[PDB]
């Protein structure tokens with residue numbers, strides 16, 4: 400074939416990103432798991448020659464298999480291809496010469512939104528009080544970031560309040576692109592792996608058939624909205640993940656409206672959870688909907 404879709408993970412690493420690893424000073428661990436960790440760090444001279452800035456640095460454990468090493472490089476290449484957006488945790492640099500690959504991203508000083516909502520829950524106002532206006536703004540910003548990803552033919556596959564971070568100026572940023580994929584060629588992705596999965600955030604077709612699409616990211620956005628307007632409650636309260644859970648989801652059980660969700664935001668949630676993926680809204684449509692809500696506020 401003389402025309403093809405360019406696979407961003409096949410492109411060369413662009414050395415414009417390269418930063419000297421001796422100019423990083425690691426601080427505390429921000430997240431940790433089986434394969435590696437993300438740490439806070441000081442980067443000396445990263446943007447301005449004479450200034451230090453705080454960054455986040457993603458790194459694998461020395462024992463990481465080659466499956467994990469290439470996945471980290473692939474994530475670096477996807478972030479390089481996507482480009483910059485206000486509502487994602489942006490790539491700032493990488494250390495790839497010789498030693499372990501380090502991926503340097505923006506640091507979000509307020510941490511993840513799930514923990515933020517839970518801390519602010521008891522003083523929420525339906526001073527520095529969380530308000531409904533904050534929640535509408537966060538819903539809008541995450542929709543904008545996801546619309547951006549979809550516009551680049553990318554899916555995230557783990558959208559959840561725990562993977563939205565908060566930084567200065569009430570700006571929310573989507574983080575953790577380890578499972579993000581460009582799906583330009585086939586319009587879906589079939590997960591063949593065997594890791595633990597975020598079942599309560601997954602579309603039914605992802606649970607039952609391992610298929611991930613633009614539309615399954617939209618399902619997870621609906622679950623995120625329920626977390627958001629519930630001020631950080633866990634989804635499907637009182638329902639463990641077991642045979643009954645899957646049966647109920649398949650038969651059409653859905654969560655009810657959070658107490659603080661405006662009717663038009665619960666309306667979005669319900670459409671995000673349509674059993675038919677074709678009936679779910681796109682992120683582009685969601686952005687326009689929330690825009691209209693904010694302007695009428």
Ligand SMILES: CC(=O)N[C@@](C)(c1ccc(F)cc1)c1cnc(N2CCN(c3ncnn4cc(-c5cnn(C)c5)cc34)CC2)nc1
Pocket residue numbers: 429430431432433434435436437455457458459460471488504505506507508509510511564574575577
């Ligand atoms: C399955 C798995 O192993 N995942 C691994 C463990 C993984 C790791 C390495 C690897 F190579 C492959 C996978 C994983 C992947 N991402 C992450 N994070 C996403 C990025 N993040 C942040 N970014 C930017 N700023 N920021 C600020 C805070 C913060 C916290 N408190 N306060 C006050 C601020 C947090 C972050 C937080 C965690 N944490 C672990």
